[PDB]
mmCIF file of C-alpha atoms and ligand atoms in Angstrom:
data_model
loop_
_atom_site.group_PDB
_atom_site.id
_atom_site.type_symbol
_atom_site.label_atom_id
_atom_site.label_comp_id
_atom_site.label_asym_id
_atom_site.label_seq_id
_atom_site.Cartn_x
_atom_site.Cartn_y
_atom_site.Cartn_z
ATOM 1 C CA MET Q 1 -17.863 -10.205 -10.817
ATOM 2 C CA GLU Q 2 -21.309 -11.809 -11.000
ATOM 3 C CA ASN Q 3 -19.735 -14.390 -8.645
ATOM 4 C CA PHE Q 4 -20.394 -12.002 -5.725
ATOM 5 C CA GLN Q 5 -23.554 -10.474 -4.298
ATOM 6 C CA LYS Q 6 -24.225 -7.602 -1.864
ATOM 7 C CA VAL Q 7 -21.184 -5.785 -3.248
ATOM 8 C CA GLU Q 8 -20.643 -2.716 -1.022
ATOM 9 C CA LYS Q 9 -17.694 -0.334 -1.376
ATOM 10 C CA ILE Q 10 -15.746 0.006 1.882
ATOM 11 C CA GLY Q 11 -12.641 1.985 0.919
ATOM 12 C CA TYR Q 15 -4.028 0.348 -5.896
ATOM 13 C CA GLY Q 16 -7.787 0.050 -6.143
ATOM 14 C CA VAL Q 17 -11.241 -0.035 -4.625
ATOM 15 C CA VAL Q 18 -12.154 -2.447 -1.838
ATOM 16 C CA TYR Q 19 -15.634 -3.897 -1.463
ATOM 17 C CA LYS Q 20 -17.395 -5.953 1.161
ATOM 18 C CA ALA Q 21 -18.927 -8.809 -0.849
ATOM 19 C CA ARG Q 22 -20.791 -12.068 -0.335
ATOM 20 C CA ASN Q 23 -19.787 -15.133 -2.342
ATOM 21 C CA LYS Q 24 -22.941 -16.175 -4.190
ATOM 22 C CA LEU Q 25 -22.259 -19.911 -3.843
ATOM 23 C CA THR Q 26 -20.925 -20.189 -0.286
ATOM 24 C CA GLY Q 27 -22.472 -17.197 1.493
ATOM 25 C CA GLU Q 28 -18.981 -16.312 2.739
ATOM 26 C CA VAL Q 29 -18.497 -12.592 3.420
ATOM 27 C CA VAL Q 30 -15.150 -11.336 2.086
ATOM 28 C CA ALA Q 31 -13.199 -8.233 1.166
ATOM 29 C CA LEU Q 32 -12.645 -7.857 -2.566
ATOM 30 C CA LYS Q 33 -9.902 -5.577 -3.861
ATOM 31 C CA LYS Q 34 -10.200 -4.610 -7.547
ATOM 32 C CA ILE Q 35 -6.842 -3.499 -8.972
ATOM 33 C CA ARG Q 36 -6.679 -1.418 -12.175
ATOM 34 C CA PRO Q 45 3.154 -11.014 -14.238
ATOM 35 C CA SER Q 46 3.733 -14.793 -14.348
ATOM 36 C CA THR Q 47 6.259 -14.083 -11.604
ATOM 37 C CA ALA Q 48 3.668 -11.735 -10.097
ATOM 38 C CA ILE Q 49 0.830 -14.273 -10.117
ATOM 39 C CA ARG Q 50 3.126 -16.983 -8.726
ATOM 40 C CA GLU Q 51 4.645 -14.720 -6.050
ATOM 41 C CA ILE Q 52 1.233 -13.478 -4.894
ATOM 42 C CA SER Q 53 -0.210 -16.989 -4.989
ATOM 43 C CA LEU Q 54 2.608 -18.212 -2.739
ATOM 44 C CA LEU Q 55 1.087 -15.965 -0.069
ATOM 45 C CA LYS Q 56 -2.211 -17.883 -0.047
ATOM 46 C CA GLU Q 57 -0.339 -20.737 1.639
ATOM 47 C CA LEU Q 58 1.474 -18.625 4.233
ATOM 48 C CA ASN Q 59 -0.354 -18.184 7.503
ATOM 49 C CA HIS Q 60 0.108 -15.981 10.526
ATOM 50 C CA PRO Q 61 -2.472 -14.759 13.081
ATOM 51 C CA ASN Q 62 -1.445 -11.130 12.533
ATOM 52 C CA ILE Q 63 -1.647 -11.042 8.729
ATOM 53 C CA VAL Q 64 -4.922 -10.890 6.790
ATOM 54 C CA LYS Q 65 -5.664 -14.145 4.967
ATOM 55 C CA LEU Q 66 -5.431 -13.977 1.176
ATOM 56 C CA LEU Q 67 -8.096 -16.303 -0.228
ATOM 57 C CA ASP Q 68 -7.924 -15.902 -4.035
ATOM 58 C CA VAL Q 69 -5.978 -14.183 -6.815
ATOM 59 C CA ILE Q 70 -7.717 -13.529 -10.158
ATOM 60 C CA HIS Q 71 -6.227 -11.921 -13.278
ATOM 61 C CA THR Q 72 -8.964 -11.270 -15.812
ATOM 62 C CA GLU Q 73 -9.886 -8.431 -18.124
ATOM 63 C CA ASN Q 74 -7.500 -5.567 -17.364
ATOM 64 C CA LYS Q 75 -7.937 -6.408 -13.670
ATOM 65 C CA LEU Q 76 -6.384 -8.160 -10.686
ATOM 66 C CA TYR Q 77 -8.835 -9.190 -7.968
ATOM 67 C CA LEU Q 78 -7.555 -10.085 -4.515
ATOM 68 C CA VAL Q 79 -10.091 -11.746 -2.215
ATOM 69 C CA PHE Q 80 -9.301 -11.351 1.484
ATOM 70 C CA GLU Q 81 -10.926 -12.514 4.678
ATOM 71 C CA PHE Q 82 -13.269 -9.845 5.987
ATOM 72 C CA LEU Q 83 -12.761 -7.996 9.252
ATOM 73 C CA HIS Q 84 -15.204 -5.368 10.370
ATOM 74 C CA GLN Q 85 -13.055 -2.495 11.562
ATOM 75 C CA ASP Q 86 -9.597 -1.005 11.305
ATOM 76 C CA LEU Q 87 -7.272 0.686 13.753
ATOM 77 C CA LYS Q 88 -7.927 4.153 12.284
ATOM 78 C CA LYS Q 89 -11.655 3.894 12.970
ATOM 79 C CA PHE Q 90 -10.948 2.544 16.453
ATOM 80 C CA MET Q 91 -8.438 5.351 17.140
ATOM 81 C CA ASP Q 92 -11.032 7.947 16.082
ATOM 82 C CA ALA Q 93 -13.735 6.270 18.182
ATOM 83 C CA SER Q 94 -11.361 6.291 21.163
ATOM 84 C CA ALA Q 95 -10.132 9.863 20.801
ATOM 85 C CA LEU Q 96 -11.898 11.350 23.833
ATOM 86 C CA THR Q 97 -10.666 8.657 26.250
ATOM 87 C CA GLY Q 98 -7.591 7.207 24.578
ATOM 88 C CA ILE Q 99 -6.944 3.533 23.900
ATOM 89 C CA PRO Q 100 -5.910 1.880 27.203
ATOM 90 C CA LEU Q 101 -2.176 1.231 27.466
ATOM 91 C CA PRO Q 102 -2.543 -2.587 27.777
ATOM 92 C CA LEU Q 103 -4.452 -2.592 24.470
ATOM 93 C CA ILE Q 104 -1.927 -0.253 22.806
ATOM 94 C CA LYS Q 105 0.758 -2.672 23.982
ATOM 95 C CA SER Q 106 -1.118 -5.762 22.760
ATOM 96 C CA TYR Q 107 -1.697 -4.236 19.326
ATOM 97 C CA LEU Q 108 1.958 -3.114 19.001
ATOM 98 C CA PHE Q 109 3.173 -6.573 20.058
ATOM 99 C CA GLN Q 110 0.883 -8.304 17.569
ATOM 100 C CA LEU Q 111 1.814 -5.963 14.732
ATOM 101 C CA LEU Q 112 5.503 -6.669 15.472
ATOM 102 C CA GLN Q 113 4.759 -10.416 15.383
ATOM 103 C CA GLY Q 114 3.154 -9.969 11.956
ATOM 104 C CA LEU Q 115 6.065 -7.894 10.668
ATOM 105 C CA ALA Q 116 8.629 -10.349 12.077
ATOM 106 C CA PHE Q 117 6.883 -13.008 10.007
ATOM 107 C CA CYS Q 118 6.683 -11.174 6.709
ATOM 108 C CA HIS Q 119 10.249 -9.854 7.123
ATOM 109 C CA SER Q 120 11.446 -13.415 7.739
ATOM 110 C CA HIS Q 121 10.021 -14.215 4.295
ATOM 111 C CA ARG Q 122 11.877 -11.195 2.837
ATOM 112 C CA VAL Q 123 8.592 -9.308 2.270
ATOM 113 C CA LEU Q 124 8.133 -5.617 3.133
ATOM 114 C CA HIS Q 125 4.783 -4.000 3.764
ATOM 115 C CA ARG Q 126 5.985 -0.535 2.633
ATOM 116 C CA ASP Q 127 2.736 1.336 3.372
ATOM 117 C CA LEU Q 128 1.873 0.736 7.005
ATOM 118 C CA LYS Q 129 -0.728 3.135 8.381
ATOM 119 C CA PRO Q 130 -3.646 2.856 10.811
ATOM 120 C CA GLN Q 131 -6.097 2.530 7.915
ATOM 121 C CA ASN Q 132 -6.812 -1.109 7.059
ATOM 122 C CA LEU Q 133 -4.784 -2.468 9.963
ATOM 123 C CA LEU Q 134 -7.688 -4.799 10.681
ATOM 124 C CA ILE Q 135 -9.156 -5.547 14.122
ATOM 125 C CA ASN Q 136 -11.765 -7.972 15.448
ATOM 126 C CA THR Q 137 -13.799 -8.434 18.617
ATOM 127 C CA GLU Q 138 -11.364 -11.098 19.935
ATOM 128 C CA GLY Q 139 -8.522 -8.638 20.467
ATOM 129 C CA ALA Q 140 -6.550 -9.488 17.341
ATOM 130 C CA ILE Q 141 -4.991 -7.062 14.879
ATOM 131 C CA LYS Q 142 -3.804 -7.963 11.373
ATOM 132 C CA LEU Q 143 -1.541 -6.434 8.733
ATOM 133 C CA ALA Q 144 -3.401 -5.667 5.512
ATOM 134 C CA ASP Q 145 -3.310 -3.405 2.468
ATOM 135 C CA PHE Q 146 0.335 -4.117 1.617
ATOM 136 C CA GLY Q 147 2.152 -1.863 -0.827
ATOM 137 C CA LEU Q 148 3.436 -4.776 -2.862
ATOM 138 C CA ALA Q 149 2.206 -4.096 -6.414
ATOM 139 C CA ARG Q 150 5.416 -2.336 -7.498
ATOM 140 C CA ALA Q 151 7.727 -4.869 -5.828
ATOM 141 C CA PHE Q 152 5.906 -7.529 -7.818
ATOM 142 C CA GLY Q 153 5.420 -7.311 -11.549
ATOM 143 C CA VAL Q 154 2.005 -5.647 -11.213
ATOM 144 C CA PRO Q 155 1.219 -2.640 -13.457
ATOM 145 C CA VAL Q 156 -1.244 -0.166 -11.919
ATOM 146 C CA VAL Q 163 -4.200 11.800 -2.311
ATOM 147 C CA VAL Q 164 -1.246 10.056 -0.684
ATOM 148 C CA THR Q 165 -0.665 10.037 3.074
ATOM 149 C CA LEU Q 166 3.069 10.470 3.782
ATOM 150 C CA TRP Q 167 2.776 10.642 7.589
ATOM 151 C CA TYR Q 168 4.219 7.130 8.197
ATOM 152 C CA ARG Q 169 6.969 7.176 5.533
ATOM 153 C CA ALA Q 170 10.527 6.382 6.647
ATOM 154 C CA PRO Q 171 13.096 9.129 6.010
ATOM 155 C CA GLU Q 172 15.198 6.937 3.719
ATOM 156 C CA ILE Q 173 12.164 6.621 1.399
ATOM 157 C CA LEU Q 174 11.673 10.393 1.433
ATOM 158 C CA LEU Q 175 15.379 10.901 0.641
ATOM 159 C CA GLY Q 176 15.024 8.764 -2.483
ATOM 160 C CA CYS Q 177 16.743 5.538 -1.432
ATOM 161 C CA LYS Q 178 16.331 2.997 -4.215
ATOM 162 C CA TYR Q 179 16.545 -0.089 -1.990
ATOM 163 C CA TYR Q 180 14.186 -0.080 1.001
ATOM 164 C CA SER Q 181 14.949 -2.483 3.822
ATOM 165 C CA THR Q 182 12.636 -4.035 6.404
ATOM 166 C CA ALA Q 183 13.469 -1.019 8.603
ATOM 167 C CA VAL Q 184 10.955 1.138 6.674
ATOM 168 C CA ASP Q 185 8.112 -0.845 8.284
ATOM 169 C CA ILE Q 186 9.530 -0.409 11.799
ATOM 170 C CA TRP Q 187 9.599 3.373 11.264
ATOM 171 C CA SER Q 188 5.952 3.370 10.186
ATOM 172 C CA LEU Q 189 4.958 1.250 13.180
ATOM 173 C CA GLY Q 190 6.831 3.605 15.490
ATOM 174 C CA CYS Q 191 4.772 6.493 14.131
ATOM 175 C CA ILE Q 192 1.581 4.484 14.685
ATOM 176 C CA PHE Q 193 2.644 3.628 18.270
ATOM 177 C CA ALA Q 194 3.217 7.298 19.037
ATOM 178 C CA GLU Q 195 -0.182 8.212 17.576
ATOM 179 C CA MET Q 196 -1.977 5.553 19.650
ATOM 180 C CA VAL Q 197 -0.379 7.030 22.794
ATOM 181 C CA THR Q 198 -0.877 10.736 22.174
ATOM 182 C CA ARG Q 199 -4.011 10.691 19.967
ATOM 183 C CA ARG Q 200 -2.267 12.943 17.444
ATOM 184 C CA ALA Q 201 -0.278 12.101 14.346
ATOM 185 C CA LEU Q 202 3.438 12.250 15.072
ATOM 186 C CA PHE Q 203 4.617 13.710 11.718
ATOM 187 C CA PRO Q 204 1.636 15.049 9.771
ATOM 188 C CA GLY Q 205 3.344 16.353 6.644
ATOM 189 C CA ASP Q 206 1.509 17.771 3.634
ATOM 190 C CA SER Q 207 4.259 17.240 1.025
ATOM 191 C CA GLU Q 208 7.403 15.120 0.778
ATOM 192 C CA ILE Q 209 9.651 17.968 1.934
ATOM 193 C CA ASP Q 210 7.222 19.053 4.652
ATOM 194 C CA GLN Q 211 7.120 15.452 5.832
ATOM 195 C CA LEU Q 212 10.927 15.343 5.883
ATOM 196 C CA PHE Q 213 11.243 18.676 7.649
ATOM 197 C CA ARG Q 214 8.648 17.714 10.268
ATOM 198 C CA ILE Q 215 10.785 14.663 11.075
ATOM 199 C CA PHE Q 216 13.916 16.816 11.169
ATOM 200 C CA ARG Q 217 12.386 19.420 13.481
ATOM 201 C CA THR Q 218 11.518 16.759 16.069
ATOM 202 C CA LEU Q 219 14.427 14.309 15.744
ATOM 203 C CA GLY Q 220 17.066 16.834 14.527
ATOM 204 C CA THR Q 221 18.415 17.228 11.013
ATOM 205 C CA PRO Q 222 20.387 14.025 10.398
ATOM 206 C CA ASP Q 223 24.109 14.189 9.701
ATOM 207 C CA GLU Q 224 26.926 11.728 9.072
ATOM 208 C CA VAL Q 225 27.410 11.230 12.833
ATOM 209 C CA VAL Q 226 23.974 9.730 13.415
ATOM 210 C CA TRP Q 227 23.304 8.425 9.870
ATOM 211 C CA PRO Q 228 26.456 7.444 7.962
ATOM 212 C CA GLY Q 229 25.749 8.004 4.301
ATOM 213 C CA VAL Q 230 22.828 10.395 4.688
ATOM 214 C CA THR Q 231 24.593 13.125 2.748
ATOM 215 C CA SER Q 232 24.933 10.804 -0.284
ATOM 216 C CA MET Q 233 21.230 9.954 -0.494
ATOM 217 C CA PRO Q 234 19.683 10.843 -3.861
ATOM 218 C CA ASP Q 235 17.430 13.631 -2.621
ATOM 219 C CA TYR Q 236 19.626 14.869 0.201
ATOM 220 C CA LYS Q 237 20.471 18.582 -0.142
ATOM 221 C CA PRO Q 238 23.263 20.306 1.795
ATOM 222 C CA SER Q 239 20.872 23.286 1.918
ATOM 223 C CA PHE Q 240 18.506 21.458 4.283
ATOM 224 C CA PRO Q 241 18.061 23.547 7.444
ATOM 225 C CA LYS Q 242 19.905 22.249 10.519
ATOM 226 C CA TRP Q 243 17.398 21.769 13.336
ATOM 227 C CA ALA Q 244 18.571 20.557 16.723
ATOM 228 C CA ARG Q 245 17.017 17.424 18.130
ATOM 229 C CA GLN Q 246 14.228 18.234 20.565
ATOM 230 C CA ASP Q 247 13.685 16.942 24.085
ATOM 231 C CA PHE Q 248 12.373 13.426 23.510
ATOM 232 C CA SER Q 249 10.097 13.710 26.559
ATOM 233 C CA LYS Q 250 7.904 16.181 24.624
ATOM 234 C CA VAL Q 251 7.217 13.559 21.979
ATOM 235 C CA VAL Q 252 4.964 10.924 23.580
ATOM 236 C CA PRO Q 253 4.019 12.091 27.089
ATOM 237 C CA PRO Q 254 3.030 10.452 29.399
ATOM 238 C CA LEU Q 255 4.412 7.154 28.054
ATOM 239 C CA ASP Q 256 6.846 5.530 30.488
ATOM 240 C CA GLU Q 257 10.566 5.080 29.916
ATOM 241 C CA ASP Q 258 10.164 1.503 28.632
ATOM 242 C CA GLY Q 259 7.806 2.754 25.930
ATOM 243 C CA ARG Q 260 9.893 5.827 25.130
ATOM 244 C CA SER Q 261 13.043 3.681 24.892
ATOM 245 C CA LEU Q 262 11.389 1.289 22.425
ATOM 246 C CA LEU Q 263 10.002 4.162 20.363
ATOM 247 C CA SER Q 264 13.378 5.853 20.106
ATOM 248 C CA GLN Q 265 14.855 2.617 18.720
ATOM 249 C CA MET Q 266 12.053 2.342 16.161
ATOM 250 C CA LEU Q 267 12.715 5.941 15.023
ATOM 251 C CA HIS Q 268 16.512 5.753 14.610
ATOM 252 C CA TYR Q 269 17.523 7.556 11.435
ATOM 253 C CA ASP Q 270 20.063 4.937 10.323
ATOM 254 C CA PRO Q 271 18.180 1.869 9.013
ATOM 255 C CA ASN Q 272 21.134 -0.185 10.170
ATOM 256 C CA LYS Q 273 20.629 1.023 13.758
ATOM 257 C CA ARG Q 274 16.834 0.911 13.760
ATOM 258 C CA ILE Q 275 15.506 -1.987 15.828
ATOM 259 C CA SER Q 276 14.228 -5.105 14.058
ATOM 260 C CA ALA Q 277 10.772 -6.547 14.646
ATOM 261 C CA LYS Q 278 12.277 -9.658 16.270
ATOM 262 C CA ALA Q 279 14.416 -7.590 18.654
ATOM 263 C CA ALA Q 280 11.562 -5.193 19.420
ATOM 264 C CA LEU Q 281 9.519 -8.167 20.643
ATOM 265 C CA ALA Q 282 12.196 -8.780 23.305
ATOM 266 C CA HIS Q 283 12.174 -5.205 24.591
ATOM 267 C CA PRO Q 284 11.270 -4.771 28.314
ATOM 268 C CA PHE Q 285 8.156 -2.823 27.286
ATOM 269 C CA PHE Q 286 6.489 -6.152 26.449
ATOM 270 C CA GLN Q 287 7.322 -8.019 29.685
ATOM 271 C CA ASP Q 288 3.789 -7.517 31.010
ATOM 272 C CA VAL Q 289 1.938 -7.750 27.680
ATOM 273 C CA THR Q 290 -1.574 -9.207 27.644
ATOM 274 C CA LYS Q 291 -4.401 -9.547 25.100
ATOM 275 C CA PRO Q 292 -7.348 -7.375 26.192
ATOM 276 C CA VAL Q 293 -10.692 -7.257 24.385
ATOM 277 C CA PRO Q 294 -11.540 -3.909 22.708
ATOM 278 C CA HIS Q 295 -14.957 -2.298 22.916
ATOM 279 C CA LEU Q 296 -16.065 -2.310 19.273
ATOM 280 C CA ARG Q 297 -19.240 -0.805 17.860
ATOM 281 C CA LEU Q 298 -20.020 -2.322 14.464
HETATM 282 O O1 8KQ M 301 -11.522 -6.956 5.723
HETATM 283 C C1 8KQ M 301 -10.560 -6.871 4.916
HETATM 284 O O2 8KQ M 301 -9.895 -7.879 4.550
HETATM 285 C C2 8KQ M 301 -10.103 -5.520 4.372
HETATM 286 C C3 8KQ M 301 -9.070 -5.568 3.460
HETATM 287 C C4 8KQ M 301 -8.598 -4.399 2.908
HETATM 288 C C5 8KQ M 301 -7.467 -4.507 1.900
HETATM 289 F F1 8KQ M 301 -7.960 -5.103 0.768
HETATM 290 F F2 8KQ M 301 -7.035 -3.249 1.613
HETATM 291 F F3 8KQ M 301 -6.472 -5.288 2.390
HETATM 292 C C6 8KQ M 301 -9.138 -3.182 3.279
HETATM 293 C C7 8KQ M 301 -10.166 -3.128 4.208
HETATM 294 C C8 8KQ M 301 -10.673 -4.314 4.759
HETATM 295 N N1 8KQ M 301 -11.769 -4.283 5.712
HETATM 296 C C9 8KQ M 301 -12.383 -3.007 6.124
HETATM 297 C C10 8KQ M 301 -11.561 -2.406 7.265
HETATM 298 C C11 8KQ M 301 -12.146 -1.135 7.848
HETATM 299 C C12 8KQ M 301 -13.694 -1.004 7.750
HETATM 300 N N2 8KQ M 301 -14.501 -0.035 8.186
HETATM 301 C C13 8KQ M 301 -15.782 -0.335 7.877
HETATM 302 C C14 8KQ M 301 -16.971 0.369 8.127
HETATM 303 C C15 8KQ M 301 -18.190 -0.152 7.704
HETATM 304 C C16 8KQ M 301 -18.237 -1.376 7.032
HETATM 305 C C17 8KQ M 301 -17.061 -2.080 6.786
HETATM 306 C C18 8KQ M 301 -15.831 -1.553 7.209
HETATM 307 C C19 8KQ M 301 -14.480 -1.979 7.130
HETATM 308 C C20 8KQ M 301 -13.835 -3.247 6.525
HETATM 309 O O1 8KQ M 302 -2.498 -6.533 0.839
HETATM 310 C C1 8KQ M 302 -2.504 -6.412 -0.419
HETATM 311 O O2 8KQ M 302 -3.273 -5.596 -0.973
HETATM 312 C C2 8KQ M 302 -1.575 -7.242 -1.303
HETATM 313 C C3 8KQ M 302 -1.362 -6.822 -2.606
HETATM 314 C C4 8KQ M 302 -0.492 -7.545 -3.428
HETATM 315 C C5 8KQ M 302 -0.275 -7.103 -4.880
HETATM 316 F F1 8KQ M 302 0.982 -7.324 -5.351
HETATM 317 F F2 8KQ M 302 -1.069 -7.856 -5.631
HETATM 318 F F3 8KQ M 302 -0.603 -5.796 -5.065
HETATM 319 C C6 8KQ M 302 0.130 -8.688 -2.942
HETATM 320 C C7 8KQ M 302 -0.073 -9.098 -1.632
HETATM 321 C C8 8KQ M 302 -0.923 -8.367 -0.805
HETATM 322 N N1 8KQ M 302 -1.182 -8.761 0.567
HETATM 323 C C9 8KQ M 302 -0.782 -10.069 1.102
HETATM 324 C C10 8KQ M 302 -1.861 -10.526 2.063
HETATM 325 C C11 8KQ M 302 -1.599 -11.923 2.584
HETATM 326 C C12 8KQ M 302 -0.106 -12.136 2.992
HETATM 327 N N2 8KQ M 302 0.421 -13.134 3.679
HETATM 328 C C13 8KQ M 302 1.755 -12.944 3.808
HETATM 329 C C14 8KQ M 302 2.707 -13.734 4.455
HETATM 330 C C15 8KQ M 302 4.048 -13.328 4.456
HETATM 331 C C16 8KQ M 302 4.408 -12.155 3.787
HETATM 332 C C17 8KQ M 302 3.470 -11.370 3.158
HETATM 333 C C18 8KQ M 302 2.114 -11.784 3.152
HETATM 334 C C19 8KQ M 302 0.905 -11.247 2.627
HETATM 335 C C20 8KQ M 302 0.592 -9.972 1.801
#
């Protein structure tokens, strides 16, 4: 809108870096393309957690929904790329994982799922903080509106109609692995290639490890049966505390997969700290 100056595209819709003409505040403006939707979204303006981006305004006008967010200068994807020749230091990996779990524990405690966690638009600042952003909430609310599948939980790929909070733990597990190894864990190019990449690493799931998998909507008895690989190939040289946590985040059965609250108690975080990243802006 004419309410904002210096509108600069930076990435459901387009996201711009903008300056509020009145206040001089620099913000992130998402342009998308419902009474319940407006009220549900607006409830989130009043919720507050250090590891979730602040939602400042909601605006339904024209055929458009604008969401105005606090502005952070970089995301985890850019930082991962910048750090690819050296790797992110393990204390900083650990701090970011811990903070992202704190943010998820909070939104799951309010019965909200992110649904589209990925390194992109996980927002970071110079103070060491990381924040959940770019939620996949339009569909879950009454909002009428190429896809990266690398972080999608297997129950989503198998057509489950009712996601649980466990889908976000899966995605975060994939991000954790990618921070450690500097390569995407499951880089699929289609829904079935995504599924089969998971199966080739973690083994084709069956009723022993995932009760009910063979009744999922898109499950096919014709799926190839791959044996589970050596887990020590997956995230070398991560230590056994880290590998243990990761394996619990990547359990096939959503009922067995670790919760955010329980993950925070895992021994991996006993020595957690909050280091300062080296950011070039
Ligand atoms: O800051 C926010 O709130 C924000 C919100 C969302 C969403 F709306 F999707 F939630 C998406 C991205 C957001 N920020 C960008 C993160 C990554 C990045 N890289 C840059 C490189 C040059 C200049 C600016 C940038 C930015 C800013
Ligand atoms: O991130 C987006 O793009 C986004 C999009 C939509 C829409 F439905 F409109 F598409 C709605 C919300 C969105 N994000 C919120 C940012 C602030 C915040 N605080 C919370 C506190 C507890 C639980 C969840 C939250 C959220 C999520």
